[PDB]
Ligand binder design. Sequence first.
Ligand SMILES: Nc1nc2c(ncn2[C@@H]2O[C@H](COP(=O)(O)OP(=O)(O)OP(=O)(O)O)[C@@H](O)[C@H]2O)c(=O)[nH]1
Ligand SMILES: Nc1nc2c(ncn2[C@@H]2O[C@H](COP(=O)(O)OP(=O)(O)OP(=O)(O)O)[C@@H](O)[C@H]2O)c(=O)[nH]1
Ligand SMILES: Nc1nc2c(ncn2[C@@H]2O[C@H](COP(=O)(O)OP(=O)(O)O)[C@@H](O)[C@H]2O)c(=O)[nH]1
Ligand SMILES: [Mg+2]
Ligand SMILES: [Mg+2]
Lengths: 34, 426, 428, 428, 201
Amino acid sequence: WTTETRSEYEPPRLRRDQLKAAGQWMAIHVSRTH
Amino acid sequence: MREIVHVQGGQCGNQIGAKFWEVISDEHGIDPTGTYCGDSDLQLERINVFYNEATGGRFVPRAILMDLEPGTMDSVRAGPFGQLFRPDNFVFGQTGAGNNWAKGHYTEGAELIDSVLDVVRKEAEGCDCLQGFQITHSLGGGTGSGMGTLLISKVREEYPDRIMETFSVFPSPKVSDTVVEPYNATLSVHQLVENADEVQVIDNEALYDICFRTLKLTTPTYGDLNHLVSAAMSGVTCCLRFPGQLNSDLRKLAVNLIPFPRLHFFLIGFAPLTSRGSQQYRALSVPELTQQMFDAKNMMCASDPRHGRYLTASAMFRGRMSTKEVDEQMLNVQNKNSSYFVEWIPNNMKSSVCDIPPKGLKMSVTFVGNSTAIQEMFKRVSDQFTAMFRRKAFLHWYTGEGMDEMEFTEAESNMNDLVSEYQQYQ
Amino acid sequence: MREVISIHVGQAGIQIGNACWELFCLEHGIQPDGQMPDAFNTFFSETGAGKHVPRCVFLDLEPTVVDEVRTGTYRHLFHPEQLISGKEDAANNFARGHYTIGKEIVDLSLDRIRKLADNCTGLQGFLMFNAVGGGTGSGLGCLLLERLSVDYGKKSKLNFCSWPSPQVSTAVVEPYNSVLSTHSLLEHTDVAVMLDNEAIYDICRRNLDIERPTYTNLNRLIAQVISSLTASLRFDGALNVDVTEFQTNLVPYPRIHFMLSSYAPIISAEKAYHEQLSVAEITNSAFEPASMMAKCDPRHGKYMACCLMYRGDVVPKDVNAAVATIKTKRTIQFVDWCPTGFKCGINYQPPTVVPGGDLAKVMRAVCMISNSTAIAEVFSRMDHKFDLMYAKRAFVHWYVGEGMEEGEFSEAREDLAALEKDYEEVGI
Amino acid sequence: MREVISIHVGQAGIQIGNACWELFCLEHGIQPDGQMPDAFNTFFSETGAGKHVPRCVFLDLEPTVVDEVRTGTYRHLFHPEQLISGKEDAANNFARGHYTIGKEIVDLSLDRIRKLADNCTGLQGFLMFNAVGGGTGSGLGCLLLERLSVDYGKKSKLNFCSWPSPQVSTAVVEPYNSVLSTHSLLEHTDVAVMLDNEAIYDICRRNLDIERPTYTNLNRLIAQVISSLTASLRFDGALNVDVTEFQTNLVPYPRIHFMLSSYAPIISAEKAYHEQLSVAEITNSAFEPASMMAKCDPRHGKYMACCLMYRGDVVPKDVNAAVATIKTKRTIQFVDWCPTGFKCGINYQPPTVVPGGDLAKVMRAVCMISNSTAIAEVFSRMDHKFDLMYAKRAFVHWYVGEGMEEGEFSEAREDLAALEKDYEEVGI
Amino acid sequence: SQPVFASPLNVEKRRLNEERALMQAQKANIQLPPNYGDMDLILFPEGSLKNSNNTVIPQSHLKGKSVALYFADGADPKCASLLPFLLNYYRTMNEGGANQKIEIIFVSLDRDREAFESHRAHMPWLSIDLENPLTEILKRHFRVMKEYEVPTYGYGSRTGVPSVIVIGSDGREAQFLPICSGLEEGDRALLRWDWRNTKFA
Ligand SMILES: Nc1nc2c(ncn2[C@@H]2O[C@H](COP(=O)(O)OP(=O)(O)OP(=O)(O)O)[C@@H](O)[C@H]2O)c(=O)[nH]1
Ligand SMILES: Nc1nc2c(ncn2[C@@H]2O[C@H](COP(=O)(O)OP(=O)(O)OP(=O)(O)O)[C@@H](O)[C@H]2O)c(=O)[nH]1
Ligand SMILES: Nc1nc2c(ncn2[C@@H]2O[C@H](COP(=O)(O)OP(=O)(O)O)[C@@H](O)[C@H]2O)c(=O)[nH]1
Ligand SMILES: [Mg+2]
Ligand SMILES: [Mg+2]
């Protein structure tokens, strides 16, 4: 049992590590194009 | 927090009462010797809703036991999880009140009622945070009907602002031991309409039929019939014990469900219901518990809801879940059964989440619901009442202790009122 | 010296403020313990040395959700006294959270309003969060808005109301709490933003492409709305705004202060590769009729004012060409007495990303707060829903016995009625 | 030099000075033997070999708390003859403390007070704690105050008194005893500070969140008031308020000398780091009516003078701004004949926290001793208690056969009415 | 002497410090016996503190911390009821921050090694084994008895178990947290823990 606020509203560095362990990460173009 | 006072009355009421204290003790992780087990914060931060702490740290019950026999008092005392109950709250009365509303309400039960209001008093004024009462009793007998509704009445003029919540056991017509159910129950409904605001109808017909069909049971003992009741009892008060996303309450249930104040009679469901054969084999998700909560048999009362119309319902959910799936499940079940809901109450579905699942499960739901099919049983036991009252069936046991025949016709007229009010709102 | 006070009432307000203060703490680098390892002056008071207490107050008549914040990881962040637990929740009743059990909480919650607004002069506003159909969301919110009106005369009140859903209600007393709140919301609040629930469930379904969203995903999106709303007070920008002129730029008349809310872009990280997010397309996605957070179709609503706030790396005139193309495109129709209809503020800081959220990291974002005559549909559907159940006195005895008088429902009807007739008087 | 001789009469007097002579030992570095490991002479005297003994007398007719001090952790710090105890309790009777058993203890009390006078130069005052509801405290309180005012009448006779609370009290004869203290706390007392247990309870349960506090937790709160009041006498710094400037900017009339205390940075450990703990808010909390250390609402009255003794790291610029906003707020009112009715006692010494008490390491404190016309009401409840008591000859015979003369009871009621006559005419 | 003169920890501290004082004076106007502030000791020896899965942590990991002794029992309903709340305070407070701020060292009143391990299986903070004599020495030092069975030195039992007491460097008690004490604030006394003044240096 882990209620919703505890289970998702934990501090960002712990959630950062937990999801780093699970894979966190007219038109216009660059100056090269004509 | 919010104290809830449990009182169980009668041979029937003490048996569900003991089974309810198996279930909530399993939910809160408490040993039968009283001490707490485990490291489970979410089951201990709200321990005061049903428990009290007591000198050595034993989580003593807030439970009051009354029955005018030395009968199931010592069977639940010697049984498992029976050493919890206080050896002061046991009020016996050693003469018997066998199958008589007189020996529970007017005579005999009136002398021991002066001591059980004492036990209600000193337990409740210790902390002045009472959310409600929780009364369990059968109306088809003696002590449970008579002294059960006698405590029902006198508790209401002393706390005339708080819930009392009866998990009543109605006659259950077919399987009916003894012969005075139509007299006892009909002469007890007319108090469960006046000084009551939350009544939970439970029959042994649909309790047996849940056993024979959704569990397929061959020898359904009285232990696991009460296990179905105690699961639904623990699910209707899950939010007073566990945190949640959409927090419900007994008063949130009372304000939202009942119309005009005499319409407080509710079917009850608890439907992750399978056998042990097909126990691994079920996709346990929100769209299919809604299919199981909304098909006849799963309701614990023997009044078929498809012959009537749910005026207001509630879908108090328990578990890990995502909320737009309960919201669209309430809307589409209202859409396909549009004839089964009321045209002058839009959105006839309460919803809530208690977050923490029941023990063993991963999701569940308690479906308490007002139905205008509930007069099906009221006319059934009033028909049995008038069939006996015309010929003056066994009545000298009743009036010999002192009651008037005029009181009985007041009971039948007040109960035939309840048949008419449901009909004109149907 | 900008200093805005956030007041959260009701169970919806408490957890929508858990995510609102989730976004604010990781935006500034304030850890949950309160320390950093003067841009924070609008939401945080610097207490002692190095710690930043929020300018928040949490109110609920039940303890079950508010001591959950106390017992959770955001324990040492908040000052322990504005965490207000009641004794019993109002239980879906306007009459109880306003008359009987609502009196023991307003005298002490406004006591903390005394001690939190007396620090520096020039208070900026009141970001109040509540539910409309909740008992304490409507009742306790009404008591604070009445007594903040008599205590503070001309201070701004930015109210965010989670309005009832058109289809969902999760209660049957939901019209009885929605109608009787607009009795005491017209003459008290200043800028009232209407919010829905399954409109943003639809946003998570279509834009975020997540199978099973829930209320904690609602509050992340709403937190990004408040952050982009008050990004000007925290950070510098090319066109800084201030909530003392949102009322002067959005609402023409003193009685009409009801606005829609929109955000753009809402893109999952796995689909963020297929597009290059530019300003000339996030404005169009913001104006798209299936992107608002109220579910009110604006094809039959004459727009009256708009408030588009831009965040991050944005040049000020591809904003201006985006607003040039939406003047000339027909499907949004502007009312004939308001020739110019936009305010375009620009801030330099891009929106931050919560870890474990579903929002992709984006270099530019738009939030639109738009006042339109489409709100007449939102209140005419509640007009039909309330009196159909108030046809035969349903559920009125709970309110009457708790402190309402029979006829308070009646007069709360004709002033909600006078609310819709002013809308079609504008539209002609 | 400068010195304050402390007289502790009654069971309340012994236990208030019990925490007082613990804090006074902690602030100087006086170890509980007398040895340190010149800002100490007001409370301690040198003894040649580095010993600092208090300038004190512990008077109690019952040998039940004084002998407990003689077998405690401070046995070898007090002088053995400075602890003067009787053999028989006065036992809640003003007749014992003033007429029968207050003759073999009062001759020894003025003997030790005499020796405490002629060993120090510049005797500033006679700060005394007593127990006016209670036989030893009130009875010997009257005899000590009269006999000190016939041989030492010139020096200050400043007194803190534990008046009974209106609702909560622990006797039945204390309405008799309290009105029988009135002819010693009026025509002999120079400075009277009204206290009661219930308001001190309210301070330590609302501000320190100790829901169930005890007697010693009240004594430490009083001991901080004593140290902060006599903080100018020892520690150096800014504007200094001794015990001559005390009763010349505060006491308006010769007989109007009843005031109230409002030491109020009363924060335990977990509300202190979360707040500003600034000069601006300690004044708002001290002037808050629920922080009044005796139960008396100043709104039902009218201030004549207030002396806010600031201590710690406060600067005069914040003091002058904090007192300025007290003038602007219309809740707090002053008499029309005292326009300037404020004094400041800015001292450069942070308050000392007891290691194991219920306070934090507060950097800045303030205690304000205020005369108001609302202090007639702590005698108005006293009128009602004596009237129903004395109407038909209540617990009277205990006095009658013990030295009391009838008619003394009636003139105490007329003296109490004479005090209320002055307090109702001064506020005009 | 703090908090109690007649402690076994205090008398071994006294004999060791004054023996160093005598040897220093013999090698050398030295105050004999030495002064209490000048008295120094190592409170936990090297093989004292073990976390989960039994690895040794020396005293050097407790510096700049707020450390506290937790006396508990396995069969005590008080200890069982208080344990999840202390796990909760530990996890939320320690993980709410860049560094972790509090530390708990557990000492036991269990009957045997089986009860010891069954109570240990839920605890992630540091612990002292029952067979180590230090769990009896600190017991007599901190006056914590379930019943009156130690020959006590004119004490009274400062508290019944469970108990948290925050500890300084040299054995002094910094502040008492009143679960079962004069204030009797059961499971809310952990809120009263302050961690700025009781830095274990
Ligand atoms: N957007 C959003 N809405 C919520 C959330 N929680 C509750 N609500 C809304 O609040 C409505 C019910 O009111 P609540 O806020 O839950 O209850 P309350 O304000 O505490 O008042 P009571 O009903 O008396 O308890 C529901 O219909 C939801 O639509 C939330 O987390 N996010
Ligand atoms: N604030 C405070 N009040 C105290 C204290 N001790 C006693 N009192 C008050 O004293 C009153 C009772 O009188 P006592 O002081 O105990 O008795 P006494 O002064 O020795 O005189 P006797 O009644 O003859 O014994 C109680 O109502 C308390 O309010 C104390 O330590 N602090
Ligand atoms: N569901 C259920 N029904 C019961 C139980 N015990 C008795 N009953 C029913 O109650 C009736 C007997 O009433 P009883 O409780 O003995 O009357 P009382 O002893 O005077 O309260 C029988 O017809 C049973 O069907 C029980 O434990 N569970
Ligand atoms: Mg809610
Ligand atoms: Mg005495």
